[PDB]
Design a protein around this ligand. Structure first.
Ligand SMILES: [Cl-]
Ligand SMILES: [Cl-]
Lengths: 243, 243
């Protein structure tokens, strides 16, 4: 772990002593991207535990949510991807964070967009929980319009190669380490989406994959909600401990 | 390990997103006090390794040294104790440091004064390397005048109770955890000083004590210089890990 030496002046009487403050720097940074209908607050318990590992963390409200709940029906994936890029840039650009060591931790919609993020920004470690899949068609349409299409159900129950889908393509290019967490009984992002993701990541340094037994997409049982916290934190510990 | 949640604004286009930055806070702080003829720089290798444990560290030039080399012949223990208090206050008062968790790490003269420090400021952990002893007589005299007295040799080879010496008294009151490191063949601060210190600390939560085999007061052999680094860092790890 690295230190920053900052010269300082210590007053004592008519005089001032010279000194050095050593503080942490070049720390790994973790970015949490929430799913649709979520908020910056769902991740704080995990963000906290990550700070425990010696990280700097950031959560934020995607547009179309919270302070921009007003955009729920108009916001495009284009715009939400711009949000993730903005958060990323602000986290990477902090002096005490090492831009070469950013983890992104994305959920459902957030997970999809995070997958995409990696083709445009450096992500050392990528952790996806129940990432959504959508058709490449209609990038600049309202994201709610994507779930309007009843055929979405079928699409997430189909087999899909990297060639069929921009997110899956991004994974095929992805070279970092990957954590894939799924909810055994998810009916929103069911196993076949996961199967497609796992299959597409055949260039990552590593691919870890936890399934939470009997969970649903919300991880609505407390114990599942905590299995995931433990899964994520064990992985970050292993990933970030390594360095 | 504790986190500070700081709300932030993330710009993206005409809009600004709300977010939270989580950063470390309430960290333990370590203060290094150098010996006579030393400087803030002797400790940086250790300060560094301490930042590695999740600390904030500080080293500084005692008056009569460096930028105040001019005061070498006049500076009193009074004034050097004021310096240590000043450094301490500046370290404790940092927002990301927990004032209830400050380690002081003092060498020879610095060690003596650090012992004294504990009777006037809260020190959770106190690590003394070859701490000097001087007669209580003449507080406001030039510290160089103390070594002028040829009888100093004898005094550091005598047995001394807490009642005979203000520093030793401070230890008797000390309740934190204590690390005592000695150089086996030190002729400046020889074993009997150490014996007096060890004996006087019979109220500390704990008393660890390493002797560096065959070392001299300067730890002039590289390997001894590193035994001490390892000794100090193992102890801090155990002390500060504990919490
Ligand atoms: Cl579900
Ligand atoms: Cl010696």
């Amino acid at each position: 772990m690295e230190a920053k030496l900052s010269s300082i002046e210590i007053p004592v009487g008519q005089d001032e002593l010279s000194g050095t403050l050593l503080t942490p720097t070049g720390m790994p940074g973790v970015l949490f991207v929430h799913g649709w209908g979520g908020s910056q607050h769902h991740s704080l318990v995990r963000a906290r535990e990550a700070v425990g590992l010696g990280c700097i963390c950031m959560t934020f409200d995607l547009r179309g949510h919270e302070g921009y709940a007003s955009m729920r029906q108009s916001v495009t994936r284009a715009q939400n991807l711009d949000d993730i890029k903005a958060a990323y840039d602000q986290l990477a650009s902090l002096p005490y964070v090492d831009a070469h060591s950013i983890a992104v931790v994305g959920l459902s919609y957030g997970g999809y967009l995070s997958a995409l993020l990696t083709r445009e920004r450096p992500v050392e470690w990528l952790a996806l929980r129940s990432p959504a899949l959508y058709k490449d068609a209609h990038w600049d349409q309202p994201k709610v319009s994507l779930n309007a299409d009843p055929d979405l159900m079928d699409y997430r129950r189909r087999a899909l190669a990297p060639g069929d889908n921009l997110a899956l393509a991004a994974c095929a290019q992805y070279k970092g380490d990957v954590l894939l967490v799924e909810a055994e009984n998810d009916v929103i992002v069911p196993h076949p989406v996961m199967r497609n993701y796992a299959d597409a990541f055949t260039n990552a340094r590593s691919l870890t994959s936890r399934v939470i037994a009997g969970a649903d997409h919300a991880l609505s049982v407390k114990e599942h909600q905590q299995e995931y916290t433990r899964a994520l934190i064990d992985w970050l510990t292993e990933m970030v401990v390594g360095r």
